[PDB]
Design a protein around this ligand. Structure first.
Ligand code: 3PE
Ligand code: MG
Ligand code: MG
Lengths: 55, 202, 220, 231, 220, 202
């Protein structure tokens, strides 16, 4: 209903140190997504390898 | 009231059950050969018996107690010679047999070497000795030790046909008095087959 | 089978493995020599950086020498010690560590007067350096024993063993450099040696048992 | 109550969906009630907000290595093969959290320090924590045979957990030697702790989901030669 | 035959999995960070001893890898790359050493941007720190192979075999660590760097033959 | 005219003359066994023949030319397996035979690993395998290689009776077409002694 910010991305996403905050955000999100996708891809590749072995 | 025993031993290499539910007892004066092919876990079974490896199921019972309780009164009565001889190949031939003898040394170690077949190759570095004479350095301990349980892993690796008739003439006396020898060899044993108790991995 | 018999055996074996127990000493000497000439003839800078470079070189030389603590025995007589010698495996590991220190730590400690003279360290500085090397390199051996015990079967040498053992030596390095830097202006240094003796006792009463378990795992 | 069969795969299979559906509803209240509703401080302005990305990533950088101590203690003295795998399941997650903590600390100090990299106690401690995690991971991915790499990793984790307080309290004093002072004072402000507690609790849930997912991948990486995986 | 097949073999035996490719990177990072904990967090002081730090790290990695260059092969397979493989023995050795670099030089080359800013060096402290850790790192393996061959291959060798691996690297480290000094003063290295190219071109031509002769003498 | 014709070989390891005046010629299609004892220079003669070592006097004259001269048209016609198998103890057997093959086919390598006996062990690292099977991996390079000269040092070191029979049958087809095989074994060969030339290490 009422934020601690004021307006759109001219006000938000720019606190005077925008580069540092949005670089920390980027390098926090990217490794976590990498971990999640890596776990999912192995959880599927194990079954693919099992299907390969079933011959 | 038997000596070193087994209690439903089982081992897994993650693809095959090498042996399942092994249960065999060894009283005093037994000549035992671990019969099997080249893929069976005979080496693994021997390492389980020596205590180096831990069984995946069941335990090994020595004299009534497992091998983790009595691990000091059992190593005294033990002699294991694996595929690797276990000798530092930088020292002389006699300096290796000097480490494995308690007392009365430098007068029986040379005697043990002479009875093993290494007459004249005493003060020579092991690395300078042949591949079949390096095994003889380790096998010379059979004339020194006072152990009552010999677990030999492929004793006849590169021994000449003369030496084999001395190994299976010292062993036939050790097992005659009170000893227990556990062989695993692929060469046929010259000694009569009415003596060796052959057990297969079941 | 006795403790002293194993100690003497390992001392005898290490001497016939020469040209490999002398490489760490040569590395120590080269590292100690390189920096004074790299930064040129600067008294204050060299005097300030000497306590750090000395222990960095000592740690690197100890790491280089640790590669043969158990490696050669694995291909042959790594057994006959677990399997025989009713003396407990921690005692066998203790004998191994003491022999390794006699072959590695003692040679580093014995040329300390020459190193101190070359680097300009006064008599008090040499005394502090010797006292921290006497209590520091046995710590290095006890800390590196579990790592080499785990790595011995892997023979992924150098990078892996370093990654295992180097982080565990951080307090030793920090306190040793602090103790020597406390000798630069000749202020009394005894509280920094207590933190070394206690740590040495802690790593000497807990590493043999950990190394025994590591060896048992590696053998299987 | 504990007779672990190969049902752990089917046990932590009902708990991955709901612990991932509810691990993003708790994070997006720990990152939206903060990062846009929490007022900024005076000294740092609108940069006293990397708290939510660095503090939850530092508390759970050491909170997982202290959880691998239990995962190695239970897997050693009681000799459990499954629980030992937990040591290898939480190591990449802890390493990623330590790396994230380093990155966030570097990005948070650059406005004030002036350079990306300065050696601080709260930062060098996380660096050596990353080194220990890397050691665990490298040791695990070295043995050709399993059921041995797990025990070696457990032994190394126990050694590292023993050494962790000594290393941390030695770096804390090494900082006092040279620098002689601390950068920021211990203050969080009242209406900035609840949005940070929410984020800490959310990071706790994300790590649990990630380690369950990695545990389901490691069970099938050792039990791939049994008829149980016929399905 | 198939020199490249030998190179691929050594690469395969170096890294069994894709997660061990980063092990040298972590080792180098640990070695680099080992210095500030002993010298201090001073940025201006660490910007002058940086050449010594990085070259000590490189020398340590090269020494660590020279053991698995030959010693491990000596036990079981090292007479097969001589008896078989009808290509000349120099070319048999060369592949191995050029794999050695890809275990000790390429990881450091990749980590160069990171370690040129962790220590505190400028952009010109990385241009000539890259064209000194690429132009001289292979040379380390080339001149260390002949000494290591005799050291870990010749049985019954004395301590006099220790001056054939490390001491010959000193005139390399004399140049390299004195080359980046011209970067500290922000002056063109040029000549002191163009003489490392002559070392590379005079050691990539006579070291394989010397190593082949050393192996022949050792096995004989 | 004629293959390896080592003339007046001389070796003086340590303080003993292992063999003096050993001038023997190996024609085409020769099965030959070096007869000696455990300690004789039977491992040194086989390393003076492959060019790995150098004789103290005399020379080995392959195909009428000194061996050190050509050394390029002879290493493609030579197969020497010594006491140590020569296979890396970390790679799988399939990778090892992929190396040692001169084509890199991964289809004849599987055939070789299925004829030697390691059916199902083409993806287990050789260290995880047994001790006899590690030697069988190296001896599996007898169906792959097309080199008409075999110098085998202790072939039947840890191999069961079935594997020994398989190897003895494999060497029974090599040595009539164009093959030449040199053995040093302490186990008597099951083939009749009429097809084996025995060279005494004089
Ligand atoms: C930013 C890019 C992405 C960040 C890094 C993400 C790494 C994630 C690793 C991962 O998911 O793989 C797990 C891996 C081993 O996987 P596992 O399943 O156990 O093995 C499979 C078969 N045995 O296990 C691992 O290898 C775990 C590795 C953890 C170490 C994290 C270190 C991060 C390094 C990032 C490099 C990029 C930034 C470099 C510096 C930038 C600043 C100058
Ligand atoms: Mg065996
Ligand atoms: Mg021989």
């Amino acid at each position: 209903m009422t934020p601690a910010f004021a307006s759109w991305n001219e006000f938000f996403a720019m606190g005077g140190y925008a580069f540092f905050v949005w670089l920390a955000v980027v390098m926090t999100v990217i490794p976590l997504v990498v971990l999640v996708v890596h776990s999912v891809m192995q959880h599927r590749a194990i079954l693919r390898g099992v299907a390969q072995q079933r011959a | 009231m038997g000596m070193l025993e087994a209690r439903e031993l089982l081992c897994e290499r993650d693809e095959r059950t090498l042996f399942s539910g092994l249960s065999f007892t060894l009283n005093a004066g037994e000549w035992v050969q671990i019969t099997g092919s080249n893929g069976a876990g005979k080496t693994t079974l021997l390492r389980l018996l020596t205590g180096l490896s831990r069984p995946d199921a069941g335990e090994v019972l020595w004299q009534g107690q497992p091998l983790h309780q009595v691990r000091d009164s059992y190593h005294q009565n033990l002699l294991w010679i694996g595929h690797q001889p276990g000798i530092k190949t930088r020292l002389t031939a006699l300096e290796n047999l000097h480490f494995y003898h308690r007392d009365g040394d430098t007068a029986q170690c040379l005697e043990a070497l002479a009875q093993a077949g290494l007459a004249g190759f005493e003060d020579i570095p092991v690395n300078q000795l042949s591949a079949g004479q390096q095994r003889r350095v380790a096998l010379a301990r059979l004339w020194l030790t006072r152990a009552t349980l010999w677990i030999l892993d492929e004793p006849f690796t590169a021994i000449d046909v003369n030496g084999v008739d001395r190994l299976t003439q010292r062993m036939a006396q050790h097992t005659e008095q009170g000893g227990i020898v556990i062989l695993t060899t692929h060469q046929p044993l010259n000694v009569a087959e009415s003596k060796i108790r052959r057990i297969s991995l079941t | 089978m006795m403790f002293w018999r194993i100690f003497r055996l390992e001392l005898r074996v290490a001497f016939r493995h020469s040209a490999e127990i002398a490489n760490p000493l040569w590395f120590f000497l080269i590292v100690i020599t390189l920096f004074p000439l790299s930064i040129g003839p600067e008294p204050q800078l060299l005097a300030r950086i000497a306590p750090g470079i000395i222990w960095v070189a000592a740690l690197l030389s100890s790491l280089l020498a640790l590669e043969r603590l158990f490696r050669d025995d694995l291909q042959d007589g790594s057994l006959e010690q677990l399997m025989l010698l009713p003396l407990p495996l921690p005692a066998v590991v203790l004998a191994k560590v003491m022999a390794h220190w006699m072959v590695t730590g003692l040679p580093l400690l014995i040329l300390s007067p020459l190193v101190a003279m070359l680097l300009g360290m006064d008599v008090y500085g040499w005394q502090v350096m010797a006292l921290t090397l006497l209590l520091g390199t046995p710590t290095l051996g006890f800390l590196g024993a579990p790592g080499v015990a785990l790595t011995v079967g892997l023979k992924r040498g150098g990078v892996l063993l370093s990654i295992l053992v180097l982080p565990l030596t951080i307090p030793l390095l920090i306190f040793a450099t602090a103790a020597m830097d406390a000798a630069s202006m000749h202020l009394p240094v005894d509280g920094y040696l207590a933190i070394l003796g206690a740590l040495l006792a802690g790593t000497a009463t807990l590493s043999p048992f950990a190394t025994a378990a590591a060896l048992r795992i590696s053998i299987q | 109550q504990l007779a672990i069969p190969p049902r752990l795969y089917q046990i932590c299979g009902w708990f991955i969906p709901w612990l991932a559906i509810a691990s993003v509803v708790v994070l997006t209240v720990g990152w939206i009630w903060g990062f846009g509703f929490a007022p900024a401080d005076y000294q740092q302005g609108n940069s006293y907000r990397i708290i939510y990305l660095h503090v939850p990533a530092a508390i759970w950088s050491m909170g997982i290595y202290a959880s691998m101590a239990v995962a190695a203690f239970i897997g050693l003295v009681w000799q459990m093969k499954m629980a030992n795998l937990a040591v290898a399941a939480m190591a990449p997650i802890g390493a990623v959290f330590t790396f994230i903590a380093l990155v966030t600390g570097s990005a948070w100090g650059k406005p004030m320090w002036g350079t990306w990299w300065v050696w601080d106690a709260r930062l060098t401690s996380e660096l050596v924590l990353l080194f220990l995690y890397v050691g665990v991971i490298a040791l695990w991915h070295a043995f050709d045979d399993r059921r041995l790499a797990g025990r070696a990793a457990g032994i190394l984790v126990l050694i590292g957990v023993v050494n962790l307080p000594i290393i941390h309290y030695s770096v804390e004093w090494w900082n006092t030697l040279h620098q002689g002072s601390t950068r920021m004072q211990q203050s969080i402000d009242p209406a900035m702790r609840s949005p940070l507690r929410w984020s800490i609790f959310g990071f706790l849930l994300l790590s649990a989901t990630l380690t369950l997912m990695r545990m389901r991948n490691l069970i099938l990486l050792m039990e791939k030669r049994r008829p149980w995986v016929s399905e």
